[PDB]
Design an enzyme around this catalytic site. Structure first.
Site, short mmCIF file in Angstrom:
data_model
loop_
_atom_site.label_atom_id
_atom_site.label_comp_id
_atom_site.label_asym_id
_atom_site.label_seq_id
_atom_site.Cartn_x
_atom_site.Cartn_y
_atom_site.Cartn_z
N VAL A 16 0.83 -1.20 0.00
CA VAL A 16 0.00 0.00 0.00
C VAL A 16 0.87 1.26 0.00
CG1 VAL A 16 -0.29 0.72 2.40
CG2 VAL A 16 -2.26 0.68 0.86
N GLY A 17 2.19 1.08 0.00
CA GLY A 17 3.07 2.22 -0.01
C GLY A 17 4.36 2.07 0.76
N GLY A 19 7.08 4.63 3.08
CA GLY A 19 7.33 5.94 3.66
C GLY A 19 8.81 6.20 3.88
N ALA A 20 9.15 6.87 4.97
CA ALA A 20 10.54 7.19 5.30
C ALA A 20 11.46 5.97 5.19
CB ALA A 20 10.63 7.78 6.71
N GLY A 22 10.67 1.54 6.11
CA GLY A 22 10.03 0.28 5.71
C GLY A 22 9.06 0.28 4.54
N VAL A 23 8.22 -0.74 4.47
CA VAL A 23 7.22 -0.83 3.41
C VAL A 23 5.86 -1.17 4.04
CG1 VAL A 23 7.67 -3.28 3.05
CG2 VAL A 23 6.55 -1.95 1.24
N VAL A 24 4.82 -0.41 3.71
CA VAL A 24 3.51 -0.66 4.27
C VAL A 24 2.68 -1.52 3.34
CG1 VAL A 24 1.43 0.34 5.24
CG2 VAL A 24 3.60 1.58 5.38
N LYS A 37 4.06 -2.39 8.38
CA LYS A 37 5.26 -1.89 7.73
C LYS A 37 6.41 -2.71 8.28
CE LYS A 37 7.12 1.82 8.84
NZ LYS A 37 7.41 3.27 8.99
N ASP A 130 7.98 15.52 10.52
CA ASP A 130 7.66 15.24 9.13
C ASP A 130 6.18 15.34 8.77
OD1 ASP A 130 8.12 14.67 6.51
OD2 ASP A 130 8.26 12.48 6.76
N1 LIG Z 1 -2.44 2.35 8.69
C1 LIG Z 1 -2.39 2.62 7.39
N2 LIG Z 1 -3.51 2.33 6.56
C2 LIG Z 1 -3.48 2.61 5.19
N3 LIG Z 1 -2.40 3.17 4.51
C3 LIG Z 1 -1.30 3.44 5.36
C4 LIG Z 1 -1.21 3.21 6.77
N4 LIG Z 1 0.02 3.61 7.28
C5 LIG Z 1 0.65 4.06 6.24
N5 LIG Z 1 -0.08 4.00 5.01
C6 LIG Z 1 0.42 4.47 3.70
O1 LIG Z 1 1.83 4.43 3.77
C7 LIG Z 1 2.23 5.06 2.52
C8 LIG Z 1 3.74 5.30 2.92
O2 LIG Z 1 3.78 5.90 4.22
C9 LIG Z 1 1.40 6.34 2.65
O3 LIG Z 1 1.29 6.91 1.33
C10 LIG Z 1 0.05 5.90 3.23
O4 LIG Z 1 -1.07 6.02 2.35
#
Ligand SMILES: Nc1ncnc2c1ncn2[C@@H]1O[C@H](CO)[C@@H](O)[C@H]1O
Length: 295
Positions: A16-17, A19-20, A22-24, A37, A130
């Site tokens: 799903v994405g 961030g800074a 890891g990977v979610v 993540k 951030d």
């Molecule tokens: N709990 C969560 N539920 C859905 N998407 C999430 C969650 N935590 C982080 N993300 C997604 O993580 C991607 C990278 O941080 C973000 O663009 C965000 O949409």
């Protein structure tokens, strides 16, 4: 301080994405939909550990709830934000949702509430560092906002004293808040008209450049927004004062409880004039304000 989980009880799904660090990914755990993540090679090991200690201390309505973790592979099991990111709601794919001035103000008020809670932590305050739309998640029909991924984040939301290496306080989060407010009201990406490497934005902001003024924005909101942008950190309001101010203004912004359900065909005519038009409408604000005062 809380809950442990064994990876073998988690059914990972689509990413799903990222961030800074890891990977979610989307996932399931105990028949409950979750988001997790994980790290992608140690080094994120140090950072992941800090997140654990911090996230274990926090408990607030406007901060993503952590369910547990695990060092089997090492990962955070948080609640799944059905509504997605605020970035995607604002600048996401084609069918973008329609939102009102009440939504915009409500999202900002909830953001400040979550951040004011971090700033008030004991023994010492946690700074987010951030704050930006990709790190703001929506739930309850895009009605409730929650903060995630603490810095411990592009230059478009950073306070100038932060790039210049120099010391900084929780006031750096107040600067980011100001930029996010401009962004949800105009539904424009800040400094999108600069682009190029990040250092070109840092230079502009460092010399006093801020997002263009908004046409017909209410004086009380404009003054709050520009105070947060102050070069001088001490001149910015505290996150607690922002909460109080935004809470009082919400009285003129009814309808924040309505879910996002209409698809809008958002235009967006730049043409760097000497101002920008708001995406949201303030005609109801002025009418309700006028009713309580004189006009
Ligand atoms: N709990 C969560 N539920 C859905 N998407 C999430 C969650 N935590 C982080 N993300 C997604 O993580 C991607 C990278 O941080 C973000 O663009 C965000 O949409």
């Amino acid at each position: 301080s809380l809950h442990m989980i064994d990876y073998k009880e988690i059914e990972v799904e689509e990413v799903v994405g990222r961030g800074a660090f890891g990977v979610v990914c989307k996932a399931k755990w105990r028949a409950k939909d979750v988001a997790i993540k994980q790290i992608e090679s140690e080094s994120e090991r140090k950072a992941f550990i800090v997140e654990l200690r911090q996230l274990s201390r926090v408990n607030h309505p406007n901060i993503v709830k952590l369910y547990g973790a695990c060092l089997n592979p090492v990962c955070l099991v948080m609640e799944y934000a059905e509504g997605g990111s605020l970035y995607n709601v604002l600048h996401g794919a084609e069918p973008l949702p329609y939102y009102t001035a009440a939504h915009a103000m409500s999202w900002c008020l909830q953001c400040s509430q979550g951040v004011a809670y971090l700033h008030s932590m004991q023994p010492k305050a946690l700074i987010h560092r951030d704050l930006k739309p990709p790190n703001l998640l929506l739930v309850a029909g895009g009605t409730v906002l929650k903060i995630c991924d603490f810095g411990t984040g592009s230059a478009a939301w950073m306070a100038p004293e932060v790039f210049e290496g120099s010391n900084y306080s929780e006031k750096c989060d107040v600067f980011s808040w100001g930029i996010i407010l401009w962004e949800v009201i105009t539904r424009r990406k800040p400094f999108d008209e600069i682009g190029g490497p990040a250092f070109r934005i840092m230079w502009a902001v460092h010399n006093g450049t801020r997002p263009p003024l908004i046409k017909n924005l209410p004086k009380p909101i404009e003054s709050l927004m520009t105070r947060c942008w102050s070069k001088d950190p001490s001149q910015r309001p505290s996150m607690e004062e922002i909460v109080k101010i935004m809470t009082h203004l919400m009285r003129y912004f009814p309808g924040a409880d309505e879910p996002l359900q209409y698809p809008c065909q958002h235009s967006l005519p730049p043409g760097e004039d000497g101002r920008v038009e708001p995406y949201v409408d303030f005609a109801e604000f002025y009418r309700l304000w006028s009713v309580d005062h004189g006009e």
